Amino acid sequence: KVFGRCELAAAMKRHGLDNYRGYSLGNWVCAAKFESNFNTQATNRNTDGSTDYGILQINSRWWCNDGRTPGSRNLCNIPCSALLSSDITASVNCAKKIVSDGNGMNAWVAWRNRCKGTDVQAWIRGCRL
């Protein structure tokens, strides 16, 4: 499924992600924007032998598992495919759990430099809610 700026802002609010542990929607949208562009289908691949599924992209080796990743640990205790549900609730639930290890979002390549050091308004400007 796909999530628009205000749709995602409303969903992120219903989930309690805005300012969650300080992570404002600007961080979430900026990250999701270049990562999957607010999409519950955009998947990515890693050479180590893993794959990432979920709107915010979640690797099936350290964050989740899909049952096909050639050797995966799974720290979210959740099935990767579920991160592609029509509701961000799946990924937000695992994200709200993963963002509590110690590294938080200091891993996602997009947020790491495109957001963790840029701006957090261009991803919310407009959805003033």
Side-chain angles (χ1 to χ4, degrees), residues 62-101:
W62 328 85
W63 290 142
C64 70
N65 191 308
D66 46 15
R68 53 169 218 166
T69 298
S72 165
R73 233 280 188 167
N74 209 311
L75 278 45
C76 200
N77 195 114
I78 242 174
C80 306
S81 315
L83 304 169
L84 303 173
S85 151
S86 57
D87 191 311
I88 70 165
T89 303
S91 286
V92 172
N93 266 246
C94 176
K96 286 187 163 226
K97 193 163 92 243
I98 287 168
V99 72
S100 319
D101 61 311

mmCIF file of all heavy atoms in Angstrom, residues 62-101:
data_model
loop_
_atom_site.group_PDB
_atom_site.id
_atom_site.type_symbol
_atom_site.label_atom_id
_atom_site.label_comp_id
_atom_site.label_asym_id
_atom_site.label_seq_id
_atom_site.Cartn_x
_atom_site.Cartn_y
_atom_site.Cartn_z
ATOM 1 N N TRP A 62 19.114 -8.461 11.078
ATOM 2 C CA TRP A 62 19.334 -7.866 12.430
ATOM 3 C C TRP A 62 18.019 -7.279 12.978
ATOM 4 O O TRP A 62 17.806 -7.212 14.176
ATOM 5 C CB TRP A 62 20.404 -6.766 12.319
ATOM 6 C CG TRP A 62 21.387 -7.133 11.244
ATOM 7 C CD1 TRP A 62 21.223 -6.872 9.928
ATOM 8 C CD2 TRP A 62 22.671 -7.819 11.365
ATOM 9 N NE1 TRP A 62 22.315 -7.365 9.233
ATOM 10 C CE2 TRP A 62 23.233 -7.951 10.074
ATOM 11 C CE3 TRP A 62 23.393 -8.335 12.455
ATOM 12 C CZ2 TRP A 62 24.464 -8.571 9.869
ATOM 13 C CZ3 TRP A 62 24.636 -8.960 12.254
ATOM 14 C CH2 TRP A 62 25.170 -9.078 10.963
ATOM 15 N N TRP A 63 17.134 -6.849 12.116
ATOM 16 C CA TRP A 63 15.849 -6.272 12.599
ATOM 17 C C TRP A 63 14.723 -7.325 12.550
ATOM 18 O O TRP A 63 14.070 -7.588 13.549
ATOM 19 C CB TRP A 63 15.468 -5.078 11.723
ATOM 20 C CG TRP A 63 16.395 -3.921 11.958
ATOM 21 C CD1 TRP A 63 16.830 -3.092 10.981
ATOM 22 C CD2 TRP A 63 16.995 -3.433 13.205
ATOM 23 N NE1 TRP A 63 17.658 -2.133 11.539
ATOM 24 C CE2 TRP A 63 17.791 -2.299 12.902
ATOM 25 C CE3 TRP A 63 16.934 -3.850 14.553
ATOM 26 C CZ2 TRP A 63 18.497 -1.607 13.889
ATOM 27 C CZ3 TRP A 63 17.645 -3.153 15.551
ATOM 28 C CH2 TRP A 63 18.425 -2.036 15.219
ATOM 29 N N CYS A 64 14.465 -7.909 11.400
ATOM 30 C CA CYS A 64 13.354 -8.915 11.306
ATOM 31 C C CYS A 64 13.799 -10.168 10.536
ATOM 32 O O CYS A 64 14.962 -10.360 10.254
ATOM 33 C CB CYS A 64 12.169 -8.273 10.578
ATOM 34 S SG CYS A 64 12.579 -8.044 8.825
ATOM 35 N N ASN A 65 12.868 -11.019 10.181
ATOM 36 C CA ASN A 65 13.228 -12.254 9.413
ATOM 37 C C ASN A 65 12.109 -12.559 8.412
ATOM 38 O O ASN A 65 10.970 -12.159 8.602
ATOM 39 C CB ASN A 65 13.413 -13.435 10.374
ATOM 40 C CG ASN A 65 14.042 -14.631 9.646
ATOM 41 O OD1 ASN A 65 13.565 -15.061 8.617
ATOM 42 N ND2 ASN A 65 15.105 -15.193 10.143
ATOM 43 N N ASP A 66 12.425 -13.229 7.338
ATOM 44 C CA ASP A 66 11.395 -13.539 6.305
ATOM 45 C C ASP A 66 11.274 -15.060 6.103
ATOM 46 O O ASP A 66 10.343 -15.542 5.483
ATOM 47 C CB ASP A 66 11.821 -12.880 4.993
ATOM 48 C CG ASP A 66 13.313 -13.146 4.732
ATOM 49 O OD1 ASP A 66 13.884 -14.030 5.378
ATOM 50 O OD2 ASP A 66 13.869 -12.471 3.879
ATOM 51 N N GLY A 67 12.210 -15.810 6.625
ATOM 52 C CA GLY A 67 12.166 -17.296 6.476
ATOM 53 C C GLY A 67 13.005 -17.732 5.273
ATOM 54 O O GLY A 67 13.146 -18.907 5.001
ATOM 55 N N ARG A 68 13.557 -16.790 4.552
ATOM 56 C CA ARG A 68 14.394 -17.135 3.360
ATOM 57 C C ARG A 68 15.795 -16.538 3.530
ATOM 58 O O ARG A 68 16.743 -16.977 2.912
ATOM 59 C CB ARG A 68 13.755 -16.575 2.082
ATOM 60 C CG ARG A 68 13.477 -15.079 2.253
ATOM 61 C CD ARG A 68 13.089 -14.465 0.906
ATOM 62 N NE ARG A 68 13.688 -13.096 0.809
ATOM 63 C CZ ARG A 68 13.736 -12.460 -0.321
ATOM 64 N NH1 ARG A 68 13.194 -12.974 -1.375
ATOM 65 N NH2 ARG A 68 14.298 -11.291 -0.382
ATOM 66 N N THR A 69 15.932 -15.534 4.356
ATOM 67 C CA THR A 69 17.275 -14.918 4.566
ATOM 68 C C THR A 69 18.279 -16.006 4.982
ATOM 69 O O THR A 69 18.104 -16.656 5.998
ATOM 70 C CB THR A 69 17.177 -13.869 5.674
ATOM 71 O OG1 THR A 69 16.272 -12.844 5.282
ATOM 72 C CG2 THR A 69 18.556 -13.259 5.934
ATOM 73 N N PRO A 70 19.318 -16.209 4.196
ATOM 74 C CA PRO A 70 20.362 -17.237 4.495
ATOM 75 C C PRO A 70 21.056 -16.988 5.847
ATOM 76 O O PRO A 70 22.184 -16.526 5.909
ATOM 77 C CB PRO A 70 21.364 -17.122 3.337
ATOM 78 C CG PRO A 70 21.056 -15.842 2.627
ATOM 79 C CD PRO A 70 19.603 -15.489 2.944
ATOM 80 N N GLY A 71 20.379 -17.287 6.927
ATOM 81 C CA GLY A 71 20.976 -17.070 8.285
ATOM 82 C C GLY A 71 20.582 -15.684 8.798
ATOM 83 O O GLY A 71 21.163 -14.683 8.403
ATOM 84 N N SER A 72 19.593 -15.620 9.658
ATOM 85 C CA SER A 72 19.131 -14.307 10.189
ATOM 86 C C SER A 72 18.946 -14.400 11.710
ATOM 87 O O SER A 72 18.649 -15.451 12.240
ATOM 88 C CB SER A 72 17.809 -13.961 9.510
ATOM 89 O OG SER A 72 17.166 -12.913 10.210
ATOM 90 N N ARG A 73 19.138 -13.314 12.420
ATOM 91 C CA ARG A 73 18.996 -13.359 13.911
ATOM 92 C C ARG A 73 17.596 -12.899 14.340
ATOM 93 O O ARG A 73 16.900 -13.592 15.058
ATOM 94 C CB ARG A 73 20.054 -12.444 14.539
ATOM 95 C CG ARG A 73 20.854 -13.223 15.589
ATOM 96 C CD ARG A 73 20.054 -13.288 16.890
ATOM 97 N NE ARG A 73 20.919 -13.864 17.968
ATOM 98 C CZ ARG A 73 20.561 -13.791 19.216
ATOM 99 N NH1 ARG A 73 19.436 -13.238 19.539
ATOM 100 N NH2 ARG A 73 21.332 -14.281 20.139
ATOM 101 N N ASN A 74 17.196 -11.731 13.904
ATOM 102 C CA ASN A 74 15.849 -11.169 14.263
ATOM 103 C C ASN A 74 15.875 -10.579 15.676
ATOM 104 O O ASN A 74 15.847 -11.290 16.662
ATOM 105 C CB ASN A 74 14.760 -12.247 14.188
ATOM 106 C CG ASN A 74 13.424 -11.586 13.838
ATOM 107 O OD1 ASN A 74 13.032 -10.602 14.438
ATOM 108 N ND2 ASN A 74 12.694 -12.087 12.888
ATOM 109 N N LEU A 75 15.927 -9.278 15.776
ATOM 110 C CA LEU A 75 15.950 -8.626 17.112
ATOM 111 C C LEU A 75 14.570 -8.026 17.381
ATOM 112 O O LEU A 75 14.271 -7.575 18.470
ATOM 113 C CB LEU A 75 17.006 -7.513 17.110
ATOM 114 C CG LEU A 75 18.408 -8.098 17.346
ATOM 115 C CD1 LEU A 75 18.616 -9.356 16.495
ATOM 116 C CD2 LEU A 75 19.455 -7.053 16.958
ATOM 117 N N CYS A 76 13.721 -8.020 16.391
ATOM 118 C CA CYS A 76 12.365 -7.452 16.589
ATOM 119 C C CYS A 76 11.383 -8.580 16.889
ATOM 120 O O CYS A 76 10.252 -8.335 17.269
ATOM 121 C CB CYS A 76 11.929 -6.717 15.318
ATOM 122 S SG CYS A 76 10.608 -5.540 15.710
ATOM 123 N N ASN A 77 11.800 -9.813 16.709
ATOM 124 C CA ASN A 77 10.883 -10.975 16.958
ATOM 125 C C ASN A 77 9.603 -10.775 16.135
ATOM 126 O O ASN A 77 8.501 -10.976 16.614
ATOM 127 C CB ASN A 77 10.542 -11.080 18.455
ATOM 128 C CG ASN A 77 9.929 -12.456 18.754
ATOM 129 O OD1 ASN A 77 10.511 -13.254 19.459
ATOM 130 N ND2 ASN A 77 8.774 -12.768 18.247
ATOM 131 N N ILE A 78 9.751 -10.361 14.902
ATOM 132 C CA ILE A 78 8.555 -10.125 14.038
ATOM 133 C C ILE A 78 8.878 -10.549 12.589
ATOM 134 O O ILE A 78 10.009 -10.439 12.132
ATOM 135 C CB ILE A 78 8.180 -8.623 14.110
ATOM 136 C CG1 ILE A 78 6.769 -8.468 14.700
ATOM 137 C CG2 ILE A 78 8.211 -7.977 12.722
ATOM 138 C CD1 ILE A 78 6.457 -6.983 14.914
ATOM 139 N N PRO A 79 7.888 -11.035 11.871
ATOM 140 C CA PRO A 79 8.056 -11.475 10.455
ATOM 141 C C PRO A 79 8.181 -10.272 9.507
ATOM 142 O O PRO A 79 7.352 -9.382 9.500
ATOM 143 C CB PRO A 79 6.786 -12.289 10.170
ATOM 144 C CG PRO A 79 5.752 -11.754 11.110
ATOM 145 C CD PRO A 79 6.503 -11.215 12.336
ATOM 146 N N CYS A 80 9.225 -10.239 8.719
ATOM 147 C CA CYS A 80 9.444 -9.091 7.780
ATOM 148 C C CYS A 80 8.221 -8.846 6.890
ATOM 149 O O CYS A 80 7.728 -7.737 6.797
ATOM 150 C CB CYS A 80 10.653 -9.391 6.900
ATOM 151 S SG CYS A 80 12.074 -9.790 7.945
ATOM 152 N N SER A 81 7.727 -9.863 6.236
ATOM 153 C CA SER A 81 6.534 -9.697 5.342
ATOM 154 C C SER A 81 5.445 -8.850 6.037
ATOM 155 O O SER A 81 4.820 -7.999 5.433
ATOM 156 C CB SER A 81 5.975 -11.090 5.004
ATOM 157 O OG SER A 81 7.051 -11.973 4.666
ATOM 158 N N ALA A 82 5.217 -9.075 7.306
ATOM 159 C CA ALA A 82 4.174 -8.301 8.048
ATOM 160 C C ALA A 82 4.470 -6.797 7.988
ATOM 161 O O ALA A 82 3.584 -5.973 8.142
ATOM 162 C CB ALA A 82 4.163 -8.759 9.506
ATOM 163 N N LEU A 83 5.696 -6.425 7.750
ATOM 164 C CA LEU A 83 6.024 -4.972 7.677
ATOM 165 C C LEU A 83 5.426 -4.358 6.403
ATOM 166 O O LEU A 83 5.471 -3.155 6.208
ATOM 167 C CB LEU A 83 7.548 -4.792 7.660
ATOM 168 C CG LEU A 83 8.167 -5.461 8.890
ATOM 169 C CD1 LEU A 83 9.685 -5.524 8.723
ATOM 170 C CD2 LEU A 83 7.830 -4.647 10.143
ATOM 171 N N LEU A 84 4.885 -5.171 5.528
ATOM 172 C CA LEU A 84 4.300 -4.637 4.255
ATOM 173 C C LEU A 84 2.764 -4.586 4.344
ATOM 174 O O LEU A 84 2.077 -4.530 3.337
ATOM 175 C CB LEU A 84 4.709 -5.547 3.084
ATOM 176 C CG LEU A 84 6.236 -5.663 3.002
ATOM 177 C CD1 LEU A 84 6.608 -6.702 1.938
ATOM 178 C CD2 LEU A 84 6.838 -4.304 2.625
ATOM 179 N N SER A 85 2.221 -4.609 5.531
ATOM 180 C CA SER A 85 0.732 -4.572 5.674
ATOM 181 C C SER A 85 0.166 -3.275 5.087
ATOM 182 O O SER A 85 0.872 -2.307 4.877
ATOM 183 C CB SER A 85 0.354 -4.641 7.153
ATOM 184 O OG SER A 85 -0.884 -3.960 7.350
ATOM 185 N N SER A 86 -1.116 -3.246 4.849
ATOM 186 C CA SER A 86 -1.747 -2.016 4.307
ATOM 187 C C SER A 86 -1.709 -0.913 5.372
ATOM 188 O O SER A 86 -2.024 0.227 5.106
ATOM 189 C CB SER A 86 -3.196 -2.320 3.940
ATOM 190 O OG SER A 86 -3.884 -2.810 5.087
ATOM 191 N N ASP A 87 -1.333 -1.249 6.583
ATOM 192 C CA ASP A 87 -1.277 -0.210 7.672
ATOM 193 C C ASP A 87 0.154 -0.098 8.208
ATOM 194 O O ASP A 87 0.789 -1.090 8.524
ATOM 195 C CB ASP A 87 -2.214 -0.607 8.825
ATOM 196 C CG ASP A 87 -2.383 0.561 9.801
ATOM 197 O OD1 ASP A 87 -1.377 1.131 10.197
ATOM 198 O OD2 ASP A 87 -3.510 0.864 10.155
ATOM 199 N N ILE A 88 0.669 1.098 8.330
ATOM 200 C CA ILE A 88 2.055 1.275 8.864
ATOM 201 C C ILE A 88 2.121 0.702 10.286
ATOM 202 O O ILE A 88 3.189 0.559 10.868
ATOM 203 C CB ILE A 88 2.409 2.779 8.883
ATOM 204 C CG1 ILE A 88 1.582 3.482 9.967
ATOM 205 C CG2 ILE A 88 2.087 3.406 7.524
ATOM 206 C CD1 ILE A 88 2.165 4.871 10.252
ATOM 207 N N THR A 89 0.982 0.382 10.851
ATOM 208 C CA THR A 89 0.948 -0.167 12.234
ATOM 209 C C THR A 89 1.958 -1.306 12.375
ATOM 210 O O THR A 89 2.654 -1.402 13.370
ATOM 211 C CB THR A 89 -0.463 -0.682 12.560
ATOM 212 O OG1 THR A 89 -1.413 0.373 12.385
ATOM 213 C CG2 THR A 89 -0.503 -1.164 14.011
ATOM 214 N N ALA A 90 2.059 -2.170 11.399
ATOM 215 C CA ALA A 90 3.028 -3.303 11.511
ATOM 216 C C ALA A 90 4.454 -2.763 11.706
ATOM 217 O O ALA A 90 5.101 -3.012 12.710
ATOM 218 C CB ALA A 90 2.968 -4.139 10.233
ATOM 219 N N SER A 91 4.938 -2.023 10.746
ATOM 220 C CA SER A 91 6.313 -1.451 10.833
ATOM 221 C C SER A 91 6.431 -0.515 12.044
ATOM 222 O O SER A 91 7.378 -0.607 12.816
ATOM 223 C CB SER A 91 6.610 -0.688 9.542
ATOM 224 O OG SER A 91 6.834 -1.628 8.494
ATOM 225 N N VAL A 92 5.486 0.376 12.237
ATOM 226 C CA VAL A 92 5.573 1.300 13.410
ATOM 227 C C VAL A 92 5.689 0.490 14.712
ATOM 228 O O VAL A 92 6.437 0.845 15.605
ATOM 229 C CB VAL A 92 4.335 2.194 13.464
ATOM 230 C CG1 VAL A 92 4.340 2.978 14.779
ATOM 231 C CG2 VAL A 92 4.365 3.181 12.290
ATOM 232 N N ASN A 93 4.966 -0.601 14.826
ATOM 233 C CA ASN A 93 5.055 -1.433 16.060
ATOM 234 C C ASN A 93 6.477 -1.971 16.205
ATOM 235 O O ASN A 93 7.091 -1.865 17.248
ATOM 236 C CB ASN A 93 4.071 -2.601 15.967
ATOM 237 C CG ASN A 93 2.763 -2.198 16.634
ATOM 238 O OD1 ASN A 93 2.383 -2.754 17.644
ATOM 239 N ND2 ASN A 93 2.055 -1.239 16.115
ATOM 240 N N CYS A 94 7.023 -2.538 15.159
ATOM 241 C CA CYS A 94 8.420 -3.061 15.246
ATOM 242 C C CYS A 94 9.380 -1.881 15.408
ATOM 243 O O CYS A 94 10.321 -1.932 16.185
ATOM 244 C CB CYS A 94 8.776 -3.839 13.976
ATOM 245 S SG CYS A 94 10.504 -4.370 14.065
ATOM 246 N N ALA A 95 9.143 -0.809 14.684
ATOM 247 C CA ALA A 95 10.026 0.391 14.798
ATOM 248 C C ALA A 95 9.992 0.902 16.244
ATOM 249 O O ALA A 95 11.022 1.124 16.866
ATOM 250 C CB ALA A 95 9.519 1.488 13.850
ATOM 251 N N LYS A 96 8.813 1.080 16.784
ATOM 252 C CA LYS A 96 8.682 1.566 18.188
ATOM 253 C C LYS A 96 9.404 0.607 19.146
ATOM 254 O O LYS A 96 9.785 0.976 20.240
ATOM 255 C CB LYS A 96 7.198 1.652 18.540
ATOM 256 C CG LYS A 96 6.598 2.874 17.836
ATOM 257 C CD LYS A 96 5.158 3.096 18.307
ATOM 258 C CE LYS A 96 4.727 4.517 17.942
ATOM 259 N NZ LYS A 96 4.048 5.151 19.107
ATOM 260 N N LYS A 97 9.612 -0.615 18.728
ATOM 261 C CA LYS A 97 10.334 -1.594 19.590
ATOM 262 C C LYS A 97 11.825 -1.520 19.254
ATOM 263 O O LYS A 97 12.670 -1.418 20.128
ATOM 264 C CB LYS A 97 9.813 -3.008 19.316
ATOM 265 C CG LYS A 97 10.312 -3.955 20.416
ATOM 266 C CD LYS A 97 9.478 -5.242 20.409
ATOM 267 C CE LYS A 97 10.142 -6.297 19.514
ATOM 268 N NZ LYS A 97 9.227 -6.616 18.380
ATOM 269 N N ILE A 98 12.146 -1.556 17.983
ATOM 270 C CA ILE A 98 13.573 -1.466 17.560
ATOM 271 C C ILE A 98 14.174 -0.140 18.051
ATOM 272 O O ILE A 98 15.280 -0.112 18.553
ATOM 273 C CB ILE A 98 13.663 -1.537 16.025
ATOM 274 C CG1 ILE A 98 13.378 -2.970 15.556
ATOM 275 C CG2 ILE A 98 15.070 -1.124 15.563
ATOM 276 C CD1 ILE A 98 13.177 -2.988 14.035
ATOM 277 N N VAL A 99 13.464 0.955 17.913
ATOM 278 C CA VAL A 99 14.018 2.269 18.376
ATOM 279 C C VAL A 99 14.142 2.270 19.907
ATOM 280 O O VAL A 99 13.770 3.214 20.582
ATOM 281 C CB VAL A 99 13.091 3.405 17.913
ATOM 282 C CG1 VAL A 99 11.796 3.389 18.728
ATOM 283 C CG2 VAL A 99 13.791 4.755 18.106
ATOM 284 N N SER A 100 14.666 1.213 20.459
ATOM 285 C CA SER A 100 14.810 1.138 21.941
ATOM 286 C C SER A 100 15.952 0.182 22.289
ATOM 287 O O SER A 100 16.052 -0.320 23.393
ATOM 288 C CB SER A 100 13.494 0.636 22.551
ATOM 289 O OG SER A 100 12.396 1.261 21.881
ATOM 290 N N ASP A 101 16.815 -0.064 21.337
ATOM 291 C CA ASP A 101 17.972 -0.973 21.560
ATOM 292 C C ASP A 101 19.137 -0.164 22.137
ATOM 293 O O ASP A 101 19.723 -0.501 23.153
ATOM 294 C CB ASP A 101 18.388 -1.561 20.201
ATOM 295 C CG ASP A 101 18.803 -0.424 19.250
ATOM 296 O OD1 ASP A 101 18.050 0.539 19.136
ATOM 297 O OD2 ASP A 101 19.882 -0.512 18.679
#
